[PDB]
């Protein structure tokens, strides 16, 4: 009982950890999209 | 007399020792299997 009292990770916490470090992901991935989307503004401003 | 009155165990005592015992014993696996029943609410939160 000691031993598991030391190990033995509790799968609510790493369920919810998990879950929360998905959503993290998936938004730095589209806020990355959104700032890849690089300035073509400058294009924009090239021909005028 | 004397051999009698130190051997010679009670059937009373010894029958209602082993109704008892039984019955814990039948008890004792029953809530060994309730036991057993061993978490799968972590399978649960898996998937959510």
Redesign the interface.
């Known amino acids: 009982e000691a031993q598991s009292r030391i190990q033995d990770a509790d ?2 916490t790493e ?1 919810s950890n998990m ?1 929360k470090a998905q959503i993290i992901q998936q938004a730095g991935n589209s806020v990355l999209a959104k700032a890849n989307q690089v300035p073509q503004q400058v294009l924009s401003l090239l021909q005028g």
Do not use: E, F, G, L
Request: aromatic share 24%; glycine share 0%.
């Open positions: 799968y609510a369920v879950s």
